[PDB]
Amino acid sequence: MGPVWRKHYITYRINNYTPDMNREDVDYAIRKAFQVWSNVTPLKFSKINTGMADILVVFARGAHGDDHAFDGKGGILAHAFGPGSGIGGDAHFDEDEFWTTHSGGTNLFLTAVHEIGHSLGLGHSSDPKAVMFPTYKYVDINTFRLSADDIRGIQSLYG
Numbered sequence: 001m002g003p004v005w006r007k008h009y010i011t012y013r014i015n016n017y018t019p020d021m022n023r024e025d026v027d028y029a030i031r032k033a034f035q036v037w038s039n040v041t042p043l044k045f046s047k048i049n050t051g052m053a054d055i056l057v058v059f060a061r062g063a064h065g066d067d068h069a070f071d072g073k074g075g076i077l078a079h080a081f082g083p084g085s086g087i088g089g090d091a092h093f094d095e096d097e098f099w100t101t102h103s104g105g106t107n108l109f110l111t112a113v114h115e116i117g118h119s120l121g122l123g124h125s126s127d128p129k130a131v132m133f134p135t136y137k138y139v140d141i142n143t144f145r146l147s148a149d150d151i152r153g154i155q156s157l158y159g
Ligand SMILES: NC(=O)CC[C@H](NC(=O)CCc1ccc(-c2cc(-c3ccccc3)cs2)cc1)C(=O)N[C@@H](CCC(=O)O)C(N)=O
Pocket: 073, 074, 075, 076, 077, 078, 079, 110, 111, 114, 128, 129, 130, 131, 132, 133, 134, 135, 136, 137, 138, 139
């Protein structure tokens, strides 16, 4: 198996905020994405406001210091690093997308759920109904549930 966090208690911090949304909408979306994987694992996630966090959430564009430049509106929407120190675990969102709480533009909550799965050590899935499938689709946020493949996936890593 790939790398996994060696603790079940895991912290994160939001480095900066997209102008597209209200700041409280960003905190919510992100807290909720974490909630998703917390609900199917022995993992506990604690947001820190200042200091060292295992997971840094970043909004940035084009070339942003990691070797994996983004690409303007469309195309790559976000990427994340598997578990590890430093940039390990970190999740970056392409500021050139228009981030929303709804079905217009790119939904942030949905993208976060996918990216946090990479931050936890997950690959892509070959199942289209899995959040870990390589492409973005909007699904009704109210009724959103992880797929059985996703759960098998995260549970083979932690538990
Ligand atoms: N070159 C590449 O490899 C780019 C791929 C690029 N992906 C990325 O950048 C990856 C980020 C990511 C991946 C997957 C998802 C989602 C999965 C689900 C889902 C939920 C329930 C059931 C089934 C699915 C909801 S959302 C969300 C975010 C992308 O999707 N791009 C869009 C382009 C959008 C546009 O131009 O507007 C696309 N759809 O192809």
